[PDB]
Amino acid sequence: PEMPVLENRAAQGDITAPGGARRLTGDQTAALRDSLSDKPAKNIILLIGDGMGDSEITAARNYAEGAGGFFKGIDALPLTGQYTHYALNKKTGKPDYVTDLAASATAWSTGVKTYNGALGVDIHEKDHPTILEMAKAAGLATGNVSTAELQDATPAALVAHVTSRKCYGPSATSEKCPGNALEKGGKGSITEQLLNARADVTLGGGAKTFAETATAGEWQGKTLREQAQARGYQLVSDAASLNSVTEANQQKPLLGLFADGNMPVRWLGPKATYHGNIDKPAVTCTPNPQRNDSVPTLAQMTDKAIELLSKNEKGFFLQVEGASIDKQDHAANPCGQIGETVDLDEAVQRALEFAKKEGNTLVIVTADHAHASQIVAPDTKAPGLTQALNTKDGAVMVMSYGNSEEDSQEHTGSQLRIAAYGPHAANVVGLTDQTDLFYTMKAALGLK
């Protein structure tokens, strides 16, 4: 009856013996049936892990859990599929087979393809409502959580509509998104529109832009931080401030800014180098000491968001994004890349634990694109930055990224993994388009 979530799919025995590496202890037909329900979804939790494609998941599993290991979160969803994420050429309207975060995020949040860079607008720079605005217009509580800057593409796509993702605050909008600039009659910069969106719960990094002052409007002259305060937001800066929060709703919306830029990474390690796998010692990742008890983790912010949003009888929509990574200091950083996937796995566990006992929640876990980083043989012969790592298996694993150091890792256009659990989770199985995700969520919650 109850919908289950794979309890354990680690190599079941001796990987050296026949059937030793099996992850299945028996037939799964019954399990899949039990996983299928067309019942209405009261809530939705969408976990997005930056660049977390199959290669990323495999690498993190090999390192942190062993090749035969198992993520009780990420590998735990029963229904699985592959989706396409291509963007559109702005001039021609033809596909542009390598999307950027902005266009990808616009696709699942609005359901329309658009051009790389665009946020909440199509190729005609025309606005389109987001799954989040729609949820609000139905009385559902809303949550926007990310370990990156709240102004970055993923969380912004839910609450902002600009012609360029660059338009973080006033200054930047004035020059790159003139038609969006407040002082030009526009709806304003990404941060200004975020304050208008007014989600019940918004947690993450990106407090820097909030230091900027508005150039026009009702709050002209004061910092965007001061504006949030004047508009009744509960401004929180650390773990202690966040925990003391007892409620979050439209009268007292929660806005948590936990870092100037992105939030601290989980793991630290040297970066990959030319011939690193043989010319540099094998790496063992170290914990980021900057991970204070005073700075909430992706998992803790998910927990708090769920607590606050669950108090709404009608239901809620929450988006959690695990991408504390940057560009290029974290960069071509396997250690930082791996610890990031572990961060997401923890958040996904909390989401699944909540969704399982509530029984009316659809949890969707996916990535926005795959990174060209790859797991190669210790004796690789290919050109590029490499690093050997000591995995949990007591064996070494080599990694290589096909990008130019002094250059950030590139995107690819490969269709990628999406998994779901709960009511309407079936709609992610098989091949689908990134825009189908908008429609799947819309239908599961029954939004008009």
Binding site: N116, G117, K166, K176
Partner: peptide
């Protein structure tokens, strides 16, 4: 248009 851009600059 950042990922990462060119320009987005001076």
């Amino acid at each position: 248009h950042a990922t990462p851009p060119k320009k987005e600059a001076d």
